[PDB]
Q: What sequence folds into this?
């Protein structure tokens, strides 16, 4: 359903996200080769990938991850790690909205996530812009899993419109805000946001639409089960704001589904 | 390089070994269906498999596992769970031997696996003997991953000779005794021992050949990577007590490879 090329990209940024969790990238120097423990990022290792700057618990909230240079795929990748302990992070989900008129009029955004980037924006924006200058032919991609996803999304739509495109690949990211913000992320240019979801993943199910929250369009939904390999014939396109037959299907969710995006993610062997 | 039927058996008892860690199996009432959390044992859930006896922390070595009644596959499965943390078990692993002439004359084995089994020997002997009585035509199969693998092997060797075959399926098991116990396990009658290893797995190389420890023959070696699906073509039969060319290779060991046997094992999502 989704093209081979789009599948490869989905696979690659799933591993860049998984790389944020695993092996020597929680705190590191600059210029290091990107490697992961337990085969967590083979496609990244297979490419000429190198660190540019690595961060941890940055700003008011806890922001951890890396900025990467991919000479093979011609990329500048900002990858945000999710939480140290996910199970705890699930139940503590404050369902409050805060207006975000700076990025778009009438938009409402999750207080916890919106303020998280707002506390680190200038320190990382600088280092991305720096890398853009050195490789202005390189595609700027922001990626993340879970809480790392949420950051990448808020970091994206925010830092867009400064002459360079920002693609975003989120894996099991939670809802960020209202219907107007759902419609905004859908039609905003200078980057295409790819929100990847899995079966009954507990994260993108929340916050609920009964709290006024919504998801942007489209939604890329992995229907294949946990610990099952994914093929481009198992990713259905769900176009339309909060349409059913996706992570928005009427049933009971799950946590192990959150840890399987193409491969193992949000945990390390 | 193995038959398909043997492949299916390898897969099923890997899922049975996985079950010993994961799900609501830890201590549930008898006759209740065997299930696991995080797609750890689908093939087991597929079968009419219920618990007969549930045990945990029992014995002097905190022996954990379950006795399983499989009406679909017509099996009686005894499954041994490994350590809760394989790291704090690899580090704390004592390599001191002890006499084991109850099983085979001249054999000496690992004092930890022997004493842990010795404590639960009669008790679990009894409950298998009931299931054999309940189902004379059913196949008695002892299985386990990691530590559990070793226990299963020590049990198999011990309880063979009561008028019913006992097949053993161990996954990434450590070496369990000297040269005498290995040969006994290599050519013993009344049940086949299937010793499964994966790539550069750590545990199967412990304890050292240089501490009075040897491996039973044959070996069934999984060549496919960690987090890579296993086919019949990825398993190779290695012939010979302490043979090389399989897992017994002069290279750097790997912990994650121990956590991937046909599917996720030794850990739960």
A:
């Amino acid at each position: 359903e989704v093209s081979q090329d789009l599948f490869n990209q989905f696979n690659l940024f799933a591993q860049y996200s998984a790389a944020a969790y695993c092996g020597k990238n929680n705190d590191a120097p600059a210029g290091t080769n990107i490697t992961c423990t337990g085969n967590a990022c083979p496609e990244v290792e297979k490419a000429d990938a190198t660190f540019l700057y690595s961060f941890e618990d940055s700003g008011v909230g806890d922001v951890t991850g890396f900025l990467a240079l991919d000479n093979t795929n011609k990329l500048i990748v900002l990858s945000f790690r999710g939480s140290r302990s996910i199970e705890n992070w699930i139940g503590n989900l404050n369902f409050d909205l805060k207006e975000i008129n700076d990025i778009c009029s009438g938009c409402r955004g999750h207080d916890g996530f919106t303020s998280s980037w707002r506390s680190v924006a200038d320190t990382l924006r600088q280092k991305v812009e720096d890398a853009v200058r050195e490789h202005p032919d390189y595609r700027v991609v922001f990626t993340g899993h879970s809480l790392g996803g949420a950051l990448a999304t808020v970091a994206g739509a925010d830092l867009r419109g400064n002459g360079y495109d920002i693609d975003v690949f989120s894996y099991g990211a939670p809802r960020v805000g209202n219907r107007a913000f759902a419609e905004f992320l859908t039609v905003q240019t200078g980057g295409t946001l790819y929100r990847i979801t899995h079966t009954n993943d507990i994260v993108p199910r929340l916050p609920p639409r009964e709290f006024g929250y919504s998801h942007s369009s489209p939604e890329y939904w992995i229907k294949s089960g946990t610990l099952v390999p994914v093929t481009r014939n198992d990713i259905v396109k769900i176009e339309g704001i909060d349409a059913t037959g996706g992570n928005n299907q009427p049933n009971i969710p799950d946590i192990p589904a959150h840890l399987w995006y193409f491969g193992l993610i949000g945990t390390c062997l």
Remarks:
- The CA atoms of residues 121 and 155 of chain A lie 7 Å apart.
- Chain A touches chain B through 17 residues (CB under 8 Å).
- The first strand of chain A starts at residue 49 and ends at 58.
